[PDB]
Design a protein around this ligand. Structure first.
Ligand SMILES: [Cl-]
Ligand SMILES: [Cl-]
Lengths: 214, 224
């Protein structure tokens, strides 16, 4: 039971790396070897390679959800006040963006990004599980905060597109990781360099918020 | 991974092009755990032809990278030529600089909402996160020159230093807006309710990204 939860945790971590690189042409053999387990553990603990692929998506959704939950709760508390400040709405936008930038310049989330990025261009049931549980709630959370600050309608197609483009700036330092490392000459991100990325994206958000403001 | 000498015959060149198209699809999806059997079947050629034309699966993988570099390079050669005609000007028209930035962005967005470039995007995205010799081929030949050309245009507009770490970061963040409708394709299709892009929807995307480019250009030129 507790022996099995450690085995399951190693299997998910190894599957995330192999699926992230190879999709469903990852092998149970290589997943099990990287996990320090026998190939039978995949069938025993998860049912099949296919079921382990979905458990990888579930793990990613749970991981993002635990990061996202406190931001949603803080926003609900702010909008419960009779007179929220526009400055406080902006601060929620920036705390969400800085938290995403931080996680997306961290080595140990790279396999999560690989797994999701593959599913963005070839979606399976895995993508829709993560989308419904957390990616859509996070996208809508940012769309509504931006609409709340600017005074626009969060459900307008244009607002959704505006927000999507902005999120692309946050994602560019992970999805364009090798491009920006070579172009800056940095061999790796560190705290000082993540702070520069924060300032860059914060600047663009402020400019776009001010331009959209009613 | 090594380069291959070019085919001596038209029929050879055509069969190699069929193999590269199929290999982009299979490598795009599966990386190096793609199979030559599935590549050959998708191409309508034989496994043995991969061996004769390319030598190995890994050499075919590098040929895919080279094809990507040539394709992007030809799409943005006219932009590069126009940028150099501007750069060599003593009195560069700020309006012309902006027009070149917006046209490059609109060309990128258009290509990145076409179905027939998805496999290219799959191939590069995996290489961004797990780079091999393939990424560095494409980077040196076209990605870095295009990235640098857009940075230099933004710097010219704003009056900043194109080699400044700041300008490189601003440019990279901006390019992420242009890539977002491909790299976040499924997210934005579901969030909008669209089942597919089309002319009209791509024009809406272009209007959105253009708006952002203008707001950022204006904001970065303050204090100049
Ligand atoms: Cl297998
Ligand atoms: Cl093979």
């Amino acid at each position: 039971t507790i022996k099995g939860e450690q085995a399951k945790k190693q299997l998910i971590a190894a599957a995330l790396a192999q699926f992230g690189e190879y999709g469903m042409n990852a092998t149970t053999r290589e997943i099990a070897a990287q996990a320090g387990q026998n190939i039978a553990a995949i069938t025993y603990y998860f049912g099949s390679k296919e079921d382990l692929y979905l458990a990888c998506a579930q793990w990613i959704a749970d991981f993002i959800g635990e990061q996202f939950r406190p931001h949603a709760e803080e926003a609900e508390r702010l909008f419960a006040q009779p007179q929220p400040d526009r400055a406080a709405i902006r601060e929620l936008i920036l705390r969400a963006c800085r938290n995403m930038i931080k996680l997306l310049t961290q080595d140990d989330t790279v396999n999560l990004s690989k797994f999701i990025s593959r599913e963005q261009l070839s979606p399976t049931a895995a993508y829709h599980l993560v989308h419904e549980q957390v990616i859509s709630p996070l996208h809508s959370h940012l769309t509504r905060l931006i609409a709340a600050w600017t005074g626009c309608d969060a459900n307008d197609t244009r607002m959704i597109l505006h927000t999507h483009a902005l999120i692309g700036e946050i994602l560019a330092f992970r999805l364009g990781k090798e491009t920006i490392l070579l172009r800056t000459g940095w061999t790796a991100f560190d705290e000082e360099k993540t702070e520069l990325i924060n300032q860059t994206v914060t600047c663009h958000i402020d400019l776009i918020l001010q331009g959209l403001s009613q």
